[PDB]
Amino acid sequence: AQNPNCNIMIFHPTKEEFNDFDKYIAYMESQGAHRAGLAKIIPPKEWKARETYDNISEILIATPLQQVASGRAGVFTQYHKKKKAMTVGEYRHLANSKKYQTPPHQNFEDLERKYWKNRIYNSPIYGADISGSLFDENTKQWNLGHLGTIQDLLEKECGVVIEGVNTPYLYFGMWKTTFAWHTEDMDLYSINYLHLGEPKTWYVVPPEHGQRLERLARELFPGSSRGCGAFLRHKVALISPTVLKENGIPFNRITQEAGEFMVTFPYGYHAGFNHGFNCAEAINFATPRWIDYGKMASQCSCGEARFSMDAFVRILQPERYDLWKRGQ
Ligand SMILES: O=c1[nH]cnc2cnccc12
Ligand SMILES: [Co+2]
Ligand SMILES: [Zn+2]
């Protein structure tokens, strides 16, 4: 068995190896990369996402989200308060203001300490889930807007044509902006490219130990757990590495820097935070290996969890479809 400790692996593809996306994901998995739930891919030195990021200030963040926390420092929930629209230019200025800027710190470790100590006492603003792409049309390798669609993968594996499209999303971050503990919709893969700016720190639980995190989450968020069988789908729960360690939950951490890809694997619970102003692009994808995870994925049917999903539940989980559809 490759990667038995479930360590987060870092890959350095050659330009030749960067030419076939599916092939390289399969290669990574042949080395046990998936067992960690998360992998870093450093692109070839001659590769670039686009020419410059000098012309992105006029992008609109239609609904910036202020992330308001409740609970204790190491165990909290966050809700999203809608704010008025602003451009990326205006958001960048806000991120860099005294109120929101990254504080002085010695290193990544110091910054992590400051995040978990202080996160709940501030409410940063996040430009999340903006449909669009910053990859240049002429970028032919690992262009997140030119990946094979999940609908086409499902069709190729299961022989059924389905409706739906899947397109990339942009995420404009600032210091303390947070992504809560979750797996992807239908336990899909995700790929995330950090286009520009300050780093993003990730935490991840190995897929083979996902149910351990769920069990702890039910204990730590008893109210939310009673309300919904798969409340982590709401993407509101944060648990610190110190608390995970106290409870014996296996996990790993890694910091992603500008110009680097991260891939999350089926049923790999993950969470994290941004160091400062940055922009990431992400999309879900599937491989043949995903199908069996899709079949087993837990669903939020309470209504809280946030189009393409219909067909995946309909085909892969026909028994769950009616009840799930009532929640929607
Ligand atoms: O960077 C991220 N921002 C918001 N949500 C996420 C969910 N999963 C992974 C990364 C992110
Ligand atoms: Co995710
Ligand atoms: Zn729910």
241-242-244 Cα angle (round to 5): 60
CB 125 within 8 A of CB 119: no
192-198-204 Cα angle (round to 5): 45
Residues whose CB falls within 8 Å of the CB of residue 296, separated by 6 or more in sequence, listed in order = 187
Q: SS3 for 244?
A: helix
303 HSE (CA, 13 A, CB side):
3
Binding-site residue numbers for Fe cation are 182, 184, 270
Please give the Cα distance from 123 to 79 (Å, whole number): 10
Q: Which of 137, 189, 206 is nearest to 293 (CA)?
A: 189
Q: Tokens in use for 29? A: 């998995």
CB 233 within 8 A of CB 298: yes
CA of 205 to the centre of ligand 1 (A): 15
Query: How much of the chain is helix, strand and coil, in % rounded to 5?
Result: 35, 25, 40
Which residue owns the Cα nearest ligand 1 atom 7?
A: 179
Please give the Cα distance from 286 to 152 (Å, whole number): 9
Q: Which of 285, 279, 198, 213 is nearest to 247 (CA)?
A: 213
Question: What atom of ligand 1 comes closest to residue 184's alpha carbon?
Answer: 8
- Number of domains the chain contains: 1
Residues in the ligand 1 pocket, defined by CB under 6 Å: 128, 171, 179, 192, 200, 270, 280, 282
CATH of the domain at 263: 2.60.120.650
The per-residue b/e assignment along 232-255, b for 16 or more CB within 10 angstroms, e otherwise, is bbbbbbbbbbebbeeeebbbbbbb
Which residue owns the Cα nearest ligand 1 atom 8?
A: 179
Q: Tell me which amino acid residue 285 is.
A: F
Is residue 59 packed enough to be buried (19+ CB in 10 Å), middle (13-18) or exposed (0-12)? middle
Which residue owns the Cα nearest ligand 1 atom 4?
A: 179
Neighbouring-strand partners of residue 284: 190
Identify the H or E element spanning 223: helix 222-227
CB 151 within 8 A of CB 165: yes
Q: Which of 162, 177, 158 is nearest to 308 (CA)?
A: 162
Q: SS3 for 185?
A: helix
Q: Relative to the alpha carbon of 203, which ligand is closest?
A: 1
CA of 159 to the centre of ligand 1 (A): 31
- Tell the residue number behind the tokens 């012309």, with chain if given: 55
Strands laid side by side in the 178-182 sheet: 178-182, 269-274, 200-205, 252-256
Please give the Cα distance from 286 to 267 (Å, whole number): 12
CB 68 within 8 A of CB 79: yes
Overall resolution, Å: 2.0
What are the backbone dihedrals phi and psi of residue 148, each rounded to the nearest 5 degrees, phi first?
-60, 140
CB 280 within 8 A of CB 193: yes
DSSP 8-state symbol, 4: T
Neighbouring-strand partners of residue 68: 79
Q: SS3 for 289?
A: helix
Q: Tokens in use for 144? A: 């997140």
Q: Which of 31, 18, 71, 34 is nearest to 190 (CA)?
A: 34
The radius of gyration of the chain from alpha carbons, rounded to an integer in Å, stands at 19
The bridge status of strand 261-264 relative to strand 38-41 is antiparallel
What domain range includes position 110?
1-328
Mutate to test the pocket of ligand 1, among 171, 198, 236 (most ligand atoms within 8 A of CB): 171
